[PDB]
Amino acid sequence: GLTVEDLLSLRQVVSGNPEALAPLLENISARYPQLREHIMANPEVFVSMLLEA
Amino acid sequence: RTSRNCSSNEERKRRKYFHMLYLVCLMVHGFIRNEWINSKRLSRKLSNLVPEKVFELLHPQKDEELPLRSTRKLLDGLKKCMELWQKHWKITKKYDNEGLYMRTWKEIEMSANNFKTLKRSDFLRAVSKGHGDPDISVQGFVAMLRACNVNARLIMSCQPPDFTNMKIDTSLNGNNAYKDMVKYPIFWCEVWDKFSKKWITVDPVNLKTIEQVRLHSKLAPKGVACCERNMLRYVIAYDRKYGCRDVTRRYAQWMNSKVRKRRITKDDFGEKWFRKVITALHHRKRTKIDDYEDQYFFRRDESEGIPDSVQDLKNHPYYVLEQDIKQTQIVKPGCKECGYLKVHGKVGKVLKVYAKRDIADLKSARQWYMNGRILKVIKRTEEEDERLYSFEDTELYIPPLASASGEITKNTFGNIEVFAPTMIPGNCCLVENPVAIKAARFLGVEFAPAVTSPVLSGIVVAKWLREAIETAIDGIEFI
DNA sequence: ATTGTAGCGGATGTCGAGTCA
DNA sequence: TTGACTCGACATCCCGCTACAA
């Protein structure tokens, strides 16, 4: 379960500023350890989540 | 003597994870961009860029006696469109920094240390004005073709950081860095020819050519310098209708040897994860075009053959060197090598290549028992010689059913060995739980400890007793 | 004493670097 | 120019008994 401020920055980078993907991904992955095993088990969830926003 | 530029397996596993994370992000960016391309507001303005003559050229009439000439006309249309796009696109920028080209692990680590919010309007406005880097330029060109009702995919070569790069310091050559980085494009276009039933490759901005890729593509980077920042691994195609397809096999000359080593798809977990992602992104259902494509890919996959070097036969999907045959594998009777490899750098030195489908895996008696199968020379280590047997010497093991009272047949140590579902009796079930044994013993029902891996992980009890056990475990705090 | 408790890996693979033909 | 070969330090897969203590 993720905040709404990170999902906001992520929706915006992913959609309109992918040049800046690199450092943001460094940051956010460092603030949500469980994301690792999540991403390994259930990527399609994270996808749908990024599409709704 | 050793400056030892190598990192810990910890870093290895992190790099693999981040590689997956960056890839997934890339592919999402593509999906969304492909949305923004389908924008209905844009199409209507873009239509007026295309004279009726060009449009008619884009949709020629079926020519029955020689379909080729219709294709020929189609090609001329596509070229005139590319020309007016050169004309539509006035100011073509430089990628800021490295654009969407691959970044180095070092660059990443340091990118934390040191952005124009864009969104969808700004993209549209840009594409309509003709102001942007080459990525936007191509994207616009695909939008335009789409506004003319041609089935036009957007192709994206995803360049996440290389997770097979084990090195600590990863430093790049500076000479001609940008020119060599931009030598080949990150984005481009594919177009479906209904007459020849094939996808045409189109690069209108960087290389400005049009090709019908067979075994070689002008867009695939060659040499070494160009491939540091453009490492062709995941080529994704998005179509009008929100298809998403992995088309790497088209562009990789050696897909099964060279390229397979650099994709996450080389192990089984990987393949399954990638397919999960494609399905997450693939919102339409299979068409016949998919089948014409899959047939092309199959034929390509059967035309690659033995590679021209030994390094390319490590961990090849179809192919293996005689010397890499494991001590525990053998050649299926009456099979043989499917090919030879001239060995670079020794005259006349040749290696035997076998097809992997002709290789059999052998296991000892215990090893089979541990897969729930029983039977219908080498050196071990005290000294012993261990005989191995094939899978077809063996047969499922059906363990005896439990009694009326629910008694389970045990081993010398008073457990039952369950290393595989086959070895669960038919009328019985396995319940794995630290207290499952505590439970069953407390109920004093007939059971048998399960060895699933001297590790007692649980219980084997009759099925009629299942509902009871599940309840007792749940109440374990009250025992 | 006596019961509970605590102490002692080889074949094979991978990748980086350096070296050779 | 490129591939083969060797070498270095990691991994990965597969395969309970003696002695002491309160």
Author numbering:
A (entry chain X): 256 to 308
B (entry chain A): 126 to 239, 243 to 504, 512 to 516, 525 to 596, 607 to 632
Quote the study's own text:
Once bound to a lesion, XPC recruits the multi-subunit transcription factor IIH (TFIIH) that verifies the lesion, which ultimately coordinates the assembly of NER factors, causing excision of a lesion-containing single-stranded DNA and repair synthesis that restores the duplex. The previous crystal structures of the yeast XPC orthologue, Rad4, bound to model lesions have shown that Rad4 and, by analogy, XPC recognize the damaged DNA site by inserting a β-hairpin into DNA duplex and flipping out damage-containing nucleotide pairs to form an ‘open’ conformation. In this conformation, Rad4 interacts exclusively with the two nucleotides on the undamaged strand without making specific contacts with the two damaged residues of the model UV lesion.
The 2AP fluorescence of the mismatch DNA in complex with either of the Rad4 mutants shows a temperature dependence very similar to that of free DNA. These results contrast with the behaviour of the wild-type Rad4–mismatch DNA complex, which showed an increase in fluorescence emission intensity with increasing temperature (left). Furthermore, no relaxation kinetics (other than the T-jump recovery kinetics) was observed with these β-hairpin mutants. The results indicate that the β-hairpin is indeed critical for forming and stabilizing the ‘open’ conformation, consistent with other studies (refs 8, 18).
